[PDB]
Amino acid sequence: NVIKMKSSDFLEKVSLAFHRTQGLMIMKTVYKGPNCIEHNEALLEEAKMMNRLRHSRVVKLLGVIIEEGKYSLVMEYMEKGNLMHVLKAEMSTPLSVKGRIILEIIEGMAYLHGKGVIHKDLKPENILVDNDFHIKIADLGLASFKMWSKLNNEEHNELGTLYYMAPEHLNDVNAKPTEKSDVYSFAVVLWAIFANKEPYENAIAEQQLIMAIKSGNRPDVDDITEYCPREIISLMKLCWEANPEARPTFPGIEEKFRPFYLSQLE
Numbered sequence: 001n002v003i004k005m006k007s008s009d010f011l012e013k014v015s016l017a018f019h020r021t022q023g024l025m026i027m028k029t030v031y032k033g034p035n036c037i038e039h040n041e042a043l044l045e046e047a048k049m050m051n052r053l054r055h056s057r058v059v060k061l062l063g064v065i066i067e068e069g070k071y072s073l074v075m076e077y078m079e080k081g082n083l084m085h086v087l088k089a090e091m092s093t094p095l096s097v098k099g100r101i102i103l104e105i106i107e108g109m110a111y112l113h114g115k116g117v118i119h120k121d122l123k124p125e126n127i128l129v130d131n132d133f134h135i136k137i138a139d140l141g142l143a144s145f146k147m148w149s150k151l152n153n154e155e156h157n158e159l160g161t162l163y164y165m166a167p168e169h170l171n172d173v174n175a176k177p178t179e180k181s182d183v184y185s186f187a188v189v190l191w192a193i194f195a196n197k198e199p200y201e202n203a204i205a206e207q208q209l210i211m212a213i214k215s216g217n218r219p220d221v222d223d224i225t226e227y228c229p230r231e232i233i234s235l236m237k238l239c240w241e242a243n244p245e246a247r248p249t250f251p252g253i254e255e256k257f258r259p260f261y262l263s264q265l266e
């Protein structure tokens, strides 16, 4: 189960903090100011069910700081920051670690979809890396932490990439996300891994970009200088198909990618 951690346990709003017994952790204190004990029953329940998600490639919610007008979400430390951070970094990450990161993302996403979780906001900012270069899927924006997310955005507190978003979600906020909404996102994460930068230059995410994407525009494959195996380009094109029922399922992706990684990349 989850821990109902006290502020005291941590020796001297996102910040780093040392647990007396457990060790190193990251924390985002979402709430401050007045007390709102009316949501305090739910916030704990959302947290203990998010904690039910236990996979090697899925971030573990270690505990919650639930106190008088101060609410925090604590998780394990991922030393190497996020995926984009690792790719833009000075030391060039090799084709053998890239393909493994790709297998691990497939492993993590398939698990979530297994457990009925739809990420909704998959992107490199939500793919975290440990020292050994292993990844974990995170929900830093609380897109899946429904209660905690609005608590974070409320007026009683004192404190957005469209690039990875499926065309059916652009200009249509009332469309219910599917398992394929995560699959489009993945295909653009595939491109990002091989091009070592953000797609569609760096700007703007205005009505021009959005309309070009909904019509059929996808990231520039020819902007990948580095060697990219034929098979993984077929995959990104397959996954970012305009029609969601054209896009594969993650267990389907896994079935074809695992043998490929083994022979060609590992």
Ligand SMILES: O=C(N[C@H]1CCc2cc(F)cc(F)c2NC1=O)c1nc(Cc2ccccc2)n[nH]1
Pocket (backbone or CB within 6 Å): 014, 026, 027, 028, 050, 053, 058, 059, 060, 061, 073, 074, 075, 112, 117, 118, 119, 137, 138, 139, 140, 141, 142, 144
């Ligand atoms: O990301 C996660 N939890 C953060 C949220 C807020 C935050 C933002 C920060 F910038 C720094 C942080 F330390 C915190 N703390 C947390 O506990 C988290 N994902 C998962 C697994 C899962 C679930 C569904 C979809 C995908 C992934 N479990 N916890």
